[PDB]
Design a protein around this ligand. Sequence first.
Ligand SMILES: Nc1nc2c(ncn2[C@@H]2O[C@H](COP(=O)(O)OP(=O)(O)OP(=O)(O)O)[C@@H](O)[C@H]2O)c(=O)[nH]1
Ligand SMILES: [Mg+2]
Ligand SMILES: [Mg+2]
Ligand SMILES: [Mg+2]
Ligand SMILES: [Mg+2]
Ligand SMILES: [Mg+2]
Ligand SMILES: [Mg+2]
Ligand SMILES: [Mg+2]
Ligand SMILES: [Mg+2]
Length: 393
Amino acid sequence: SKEKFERTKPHVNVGTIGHVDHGKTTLTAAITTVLAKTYGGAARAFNQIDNAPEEKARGITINTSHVEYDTPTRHYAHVDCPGAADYVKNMITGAAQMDGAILVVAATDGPMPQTREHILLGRQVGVPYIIVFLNKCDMVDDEELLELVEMEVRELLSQYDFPGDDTPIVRGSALKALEGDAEWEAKILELAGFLDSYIPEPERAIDKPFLLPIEDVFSISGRGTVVTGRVERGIIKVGEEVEIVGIKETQKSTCTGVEMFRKLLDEGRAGENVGVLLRGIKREEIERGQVLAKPGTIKPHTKFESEVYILSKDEGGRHTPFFKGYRPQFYFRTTDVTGTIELPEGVEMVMPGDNIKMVVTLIHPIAMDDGLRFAIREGGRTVGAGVVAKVLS
RNA sequence: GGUUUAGAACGUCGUGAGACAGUUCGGUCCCUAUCUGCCGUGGGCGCUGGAGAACUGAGGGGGGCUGCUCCUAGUACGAGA
Ligand SMILES: Nc1nc2c(ncn2[C@@H]2O[C@H](COP(=O)(O)OP(=O)(O)OP(=O)(O)O)[C@@H](O)[C@H]2O)c(=O)[nH]1
Ligand SMILES: [Mg+2]
Ligand SMILES: [Mg+2]
Ligand SMILES: [Mg+2]
Ligand SMILES: [Mg+2]
Ligand SMILES: [Mg+2]
Ligand SMILES: [Mg+2]
Ligand SMILES: [Mg+2]
Ligand SMILES: [Mg+2]
């Protein structure tokens, strides 16, 4: 916290996606070192990304570790999700902010079970565009075998609603480009070109009132409690009133300071990932899941009508009916919450692969409006997405 | 140290002397090796004229334990761990 971040170049929220032990932290670490040397960004290393006793004794990503690197045209803000079966909740918070993704497949193994589950989760939340990166290559010195894997990735995307053949499948090692090989360094500089060319400049909302869903809370020793998250809409100013709304109850506060990757900001606008400092609030009372709205706009609710689209075996969901009393997990913006379903009159059962309305009573109150969407999950697998119809409370 | 001498006590059994894999405190462990055996170490004669060396090797003996850490490799395997 020292340098004022000057607002040059359009901000793009990027993140990696992939299977476990399949290239991801190494991919980001290579992007950090390569873009530092040629284009003249900040250095950093692979050690600073993933850290602590829990992510070393095993050697896996559990929390969402972020990076900020720059190119001539645009400015990027990377996110490394955990990619594993047990940590799928905190993966969704990183994936929700992401506009243009970097999928990671491997030329040795190929497609894996969670590579399918990641892409299935992304569309229901909000991932318009996606790029593939074959992160091994050099392990198999053969032209025929490597190109057979390229064919399999186009099938995954085209089956599950995407361009498929139009998506640029770049190839190359991360470990060779990390240390400094001239042929492999330039092949990741080519991926930087595809991030600019393929993914467009995302359209932000700088008009409708201020909102900020919290992905993860912090406690800076000196200043107080800080809350990170993408500014989903509107603008923030250092001094304005900020009514916290969500789980538990509803608190009043003021914005002490906005920052972007340990650098100051006056006007933190919509689209970019910023960490807002609060006035006289503790680490205990503020929870991961709540939202920072402008006073008077949004109101907390725990009962709502919604036209939910349940999925069948073809898309990816259930294969059996269910009566009232069913309690799955609802993923609104960032965090999950349980809720009992109440079906309408003249509706005995809910078959899979059907379009119906339903009143859902949540256990906690969460803020919502008419137009918002979510993705239901239960039993380590998806159920179906929907859209909010009417507020009831 | 224990169990098995003589002293003493408790509990129990006995009229009592005393008794009890019941308990308790105290209580002399001798021998210079002839022979076999064994570990060493010589003298004698032999090995066919005598002497000094250096070998060969039948045969015999000794020795043979094993952890942890890296590399291959976070590779095969495994949906993940
Ligand atoms: N030889 C080679 N090894 C690679 C390459 N990319 C990744 N690896 C290996 O894979 C390991 C990195 O695993 P990650 O993908 O970071 O594991 P992770 O963070 O759990 O992955 P996610 O679950 O996707 O978050 C390293 O120890 C590398 O040895 C590559 O291009 N070539
Ligand atoms: Mg990682
Ligand atoms: Mg591992
Ligand atoms: Mg004694
Ligand atoms: Mg005695
Ligand atoms: Mg004595
Ligand atoms: Mg003696
Ligand atoms: Mg021998
Ligand atoms: Mg051995």
